[PDB]
Design an enzyme around this catalytic site. Structure first.
Site, short mmCIF file in Angstrom:
data_model
loop_
_atom_site.label_atom_id
_atom_site.label_comp_id
_atom_site.label_asym_id
_atom_site.label_seq_id
_atom_site.Cartn_x
_atom_site.Cartn_y
_atom_site.Cartn_z
N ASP A 334 -19.90 -8.70 4.25
CA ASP A 334 -19.40 -9.75 5.10
C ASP A 334 -18.59 -9.10 6.20
OD1 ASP A 334 -17.01 -12.06 5.53
OD2 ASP A 334 -19.05 -12.84 5.49
N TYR A 465 -11.74 -13.38 13.12
CA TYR A 465 -12.70 -14.17 13.95
C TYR A 465 -12.20 -14.38 15.35
CZ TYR A 465 -14.96 -15.84 9.63
OH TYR A 465 -15.69 -15.92 8.47
N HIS A 523 -24.24 -16.00 -0.78
CA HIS A 523 -23.40 -15.26 0.09
C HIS A 523 -22.45 -14.29 -0.69
CE1 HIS A 523 -20.84 -14.01 3.37
NE2 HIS A 523 -19.78 -14.40 2.66
C1 S0A Z 1 -20.21 -13.74 10.38
C2 S0A Z 1 -18.99 -13.32 9.51
N1 S0A Z 1 -19.14 -13.79 8.15
C3 S0A Z 1 -18.67 -15.04 7.85
O1 S0A Z 1 -18.22 -15.87 8.64
N2 S0A Z 1 -18.75 -15.27 6.52
C4 S0A Z 1 -18.20 -16.47 6.00
C5 S0A Z 1 -18.36 -17.68 6.65
C6 S0A Z 1 -17.79 -18.80 6.08
C7 S0A Z 1 -17.08 -18.75 4.90
C8 S0A Z 1 -16.92 -17.54 4.26
C9 S0A Z 1 -17.48 -16.42 4.82
C10 S0A Z 1 -18.76 -11.85 9.52
C11 S0A Z 1 -19.39 -11.05 10.65
C12 S0A Z 1 -19.86 -10.88 9.21
#
Ligand code: S0A
Ligand code: S0A
Ligand code: MG
Ligand code: MG
Lengths: 546, 546
Positions: A334, A465, A523
């Site tokens: 991730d 983010y 995931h």
């Molecule tokens: C795209 C992002 N992953 C991500 O948002 N995971 C996520 C999304 C929502 C909830 C938990 C985890 C990072 C760049 C790899």
């Protein structure tokens, strides 16, 4: 009624038994049947072997005494020993031959899971041989699964003497009829039976476990594949390195051999690697499981720019510098996966090899602002929701247990849809107040995440983010490079955010990339399919990082 | 006036320079003089090499471009390149050839000690070669001694472009005339001179340092042998393992390779190993420097029996089990030295090799209570003074700074006499209120010990002396054994408590024992003669633990 189970080591938890090798040796060498057992047992309670087993002398001191008993036995049998007969030789071989009896170990584990107190009771020796480490590892791997390991040479007493049983019972805080003991030597079981213990004479493993099932009332044979070993936080070595004045990184550390730095994603913890940490250590690696900046016991400063990829990466290099590591293998999932690709691109001299779970490597587009790039894809809408400082922190901190129980879900368990999250007004707006518990996690494990995120909340984590443009400009510096160190991409079939197809062009930039794929995996890869992740990482580590 | 010194890497801090190897290669191979330098420099500011140096491409990507430039240069010179000409080959060799220029490094260190800000300014590359680690180590060893390391490929700028100098000056927070810069390429010095910096063109090292001495006013050539590198506590990785419910062990950890566990004496600290920790890591070992139980950031429970040798040893085995180490090398000094011999006797499977500073191994006498044994020797009278709980704690805690400044003294500095201490009524009764400072320690280093011993005081530490009978009975179990793993005894000429002659019979029980001896060294061996200790431990580790 039974509350304790006791397993012998040789011939019970470890196979082949070494008596097995003395038999084979006589035969292989055409010596008189049992002669090597006669030398071994020579003098009974006062002989060289009992002194070994009680800890009076070491294995290296005992070796030349066994030699002598071997001579005396053969002169009285009117035969010769072969040229270059070697006791050291025979025993080293016998000892490196013996492995853990996996089905017996798994029965011991299950019995302990249903609340038996378990122990290993073994006549063994103080091992000072050059090759002592092999057995030390085996003893280490076995012992962490038991309540007690009682060795004859550490307690000064030997099976079948009745005092060691009394020591056993006293260590177990249990009476003799609460106890089952398995051993492959019936003489060893006699005194146990006399105190009134259930005993089981171990020849073939399956019949022993049949008797053990019948006596404990617990299913042990033909039971499903158990999960790999997990980690209990308070049994771990915890480390702390200050990378600059306001900022320390915490990590959990286990194992020896090449450094392997594990980097977790959002919103996670070192503990997300709990199933990998013992397996990778056991496979001969030095595992460092980070709390990434923002999380757990690492520092979580408030400012957005403390979490751009440039800074996160520089600080991971500082972490290596202070620990004195010229390189580590970097394995990320991730957000941690995105970070390890960037370590490979900006610090290849510091990365022995690089692996990512789920997160693909896609080169920045120098002709499209990342906000734009984001809008051209419905599945990443939730990232816009993360931008405005305060908003997502309020929703995610409002009820922690609900937050993790809603996030951490297997692919068939009603995963959160990451869909028009802004329009809906939040991530949980359409999810229950009290989600059920995913099969992937216990209620205890959820409360570990809850307790970690009570220290700093979601500001730091969300800040990862919040550096889209800054990370974009940085990544654009790297667009002429390729990643030419050993690299592994592991895709997860049913991760609907980081889909396997997003990784399909990685070979254009990583020409020698290796791959794994996990089917039926959402995931949360490490805890969704811990067994398969372990197998894929260990096989890649052993071939490409070793 | 000068407040900053800047050293080039190739040809200045590291030798031979790699331009040096291109010259040699043409000659060795009978190619046209300078041809390899022409390929290397081909295209100047837009050529392959400048792209490498700015970080646009990696070293592996640049390799086949240099090949091509090598071809183009030779066709225009009307010659051929030899069969199996290999750029990769030539560069690997050149790079593993270059070592740290020790005299230049030591000048940089001294200048930093007199308060210069120092830096390394280098045109270098993003190294993704299979053999990248060699240079990563060298860069790691160099960088820890400087305020900044500025690399062309990390900042996207190259000497001799004027922007990198402006970046330099801005990083140094200093103006151009406060700056001396040394480089072996005069073109590199031109822009520096233009801003008004002092520059020094580096051919032979000694003339450079002569110019550098003359310009800074500081003696740098022919200066004495400096101390090994020490440790700053807040730059270290700090680790913590719980060995049982009330008891954690703290340790400082640095380096990779075989585990080496350092065990300090009374009344000391992990910090007593500050001079060994960087050297042993640098020699390819994973150093674990303990706070022993009772000390520093390890737990200090009050009860006397928590400090018998049996328990201390079992807990050190637990420490290994939780960290996932099947073995470590154990190196002990003073009480820690006594402990490591006992680890060798009761857990040889867990000890890769064993070394003691000062503390000999003398088998317990099963016919004489240790109190008795103690009275038959005037030098150990002070141990009786330690027995009565409370007495020695009051004297030693009463003024901490005076306690350590009185204890930590070189052999010619009026060492505390350990003589009729009971009769005198204490250890310090005949010592000044304000002792002078030993040459062995700074005032800062004393205040580190003071601050450590403010956490728990002297109860735990003194308790190590309070288990004479219990340790005796335990040690008697071991009287039939020998120590047959690799073992080193290092005696200190002028330690008048643990005298070298006390070790004279160790070969009766440790037949393959190796030895070192340090002359003119009192009781505080690691800080009295840190340079000699380092040399003796590293040479024994490399031959017997590797
Ligand atoms: C795209 C992002 N992953 C991500 O948002 N995971 C996520 C999304 C929502 C909830 C938990 C985890 C990072 C760049 C790899
Ligand atoms: C004899 C003892 N060392 C010892 O008292 N050192 C000492 C004595 C006084 C002051 C500081 C240190 C242990 C067994 C090796
Ligand atoms: Mg057996
Ligand atoms: Mg140079």
């Amino acid at each position: 009624t039974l509350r304790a189970a006791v397993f012998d080591l040789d011939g019970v938890l470890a196979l082949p038994a070494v008596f097995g090798v003395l038999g084979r040796t006589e035969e292989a060498l055409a010596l008189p049947r049992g002669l090597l057992n006669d030398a071994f047992q020579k003098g009974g309670p006062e002989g060289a072997t009992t002194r070994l087993m009680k800890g009076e002398i070491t294995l290296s001191q005992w070796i030349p005494l066994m030699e002598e008993n071997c001579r005396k036995c053969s002169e009285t049998a009117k035969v010769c020993l072969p040229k270059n007969f070697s006791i050291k030789e025979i025993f080293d071989k016998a000892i490196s031959a013996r492995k853990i009896n996996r089905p017996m170990l798994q029965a011991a584990l299950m019995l302990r899971k249903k609340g038996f107190t378990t122990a290993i009771l073994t006549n063994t020796w103080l091992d000072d041989r050059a090759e002592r480490d092999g057995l030390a590892q085996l003893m280490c791997e076995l012992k962490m699964h038991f309540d007690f390991l009682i060795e004859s040479c550490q307690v000064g007493m030997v099976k079948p003497e009745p005092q060691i049983y009394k020591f056993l019972l006293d260590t177990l805080k249990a009476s003799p009829s609460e106890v089952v003991f398995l051993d492959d030597i019936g003489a060893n079981l006699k005194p146990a039976r006399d105190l009134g213990m259930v005993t089981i004479l171990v020849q073939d493993t399956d019949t022993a476990l049949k008797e053990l099932e019948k006596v404990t009332g617990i299913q042990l044979l033909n039971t499903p594949a158990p999960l790999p070993t997990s980690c209990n936080p308070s049994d771990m070595s915890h480390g702390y390195v200050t990378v600059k004045p306001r900022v320390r990184l915490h990590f959990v550390e286990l194992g020896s051999g090449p450094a392997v730095c594990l980097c977790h994603g959002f919103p996670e913890s070192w503990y997300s690697w709990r199933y990998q940490i013992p397996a990778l250590a056991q496979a001969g690696y030095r595992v460092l499981a980070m709390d990434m900046k923002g999380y757990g016991e690492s520092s979580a400063p408030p400012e957005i720019e403390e979490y751009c990829m440039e800074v996160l990466c520089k600080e991971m290099v500082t972490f290596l510098d202070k620990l004195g590591l010229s390189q580590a293998v970097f394995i990320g999932h991730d957000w941690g996966g995105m970070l390890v690709w960037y370590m490979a691109l900006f610090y290849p001299e510091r990365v022995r090899a690089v692996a990512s779970l789920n997160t693909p490597f896609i080169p920045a587009n120098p002709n499209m602002s990342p906000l734009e790039s984001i809008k051209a894809n419905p599945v990443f809408d939730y990232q816009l929701y993360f931008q405005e400082p305060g908003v997502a922190e309020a929703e995610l901190e409002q009820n922690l247990s609900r937050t993790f129980k809603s996030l951490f879900r297997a692919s068939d368990e009603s995963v959160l849809s990451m869909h028009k999250v802004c329009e809906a007004g939040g991530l949980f707006v359409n999810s229950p107040e009290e989600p059920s518990l995913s099969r992937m996690v216990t209620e205890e494990e959820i409360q570990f995440y809850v307790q970690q995120f009570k220290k700093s909340g979601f500001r730091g984590p969300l800040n990862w983010y919040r550096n889209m443009e800054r990370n974009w400009k940085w990544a654009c510096k790297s667009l002429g490079r390729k990643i030419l160190i050993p690299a592994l991409m592991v895709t997860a079939e049913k991760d609907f955010v980081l889909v396997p197809q997003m990784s399909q062009h990685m070979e254009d930039w990583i020409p020698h990339l290796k791959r794994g794929h996990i089917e039926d995996c959402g995931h949360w890869t490490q805890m969704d399919k811990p067994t398969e992740v372990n197998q894929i990482l260990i096989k890649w580590l052993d071939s490409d990082a070793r």
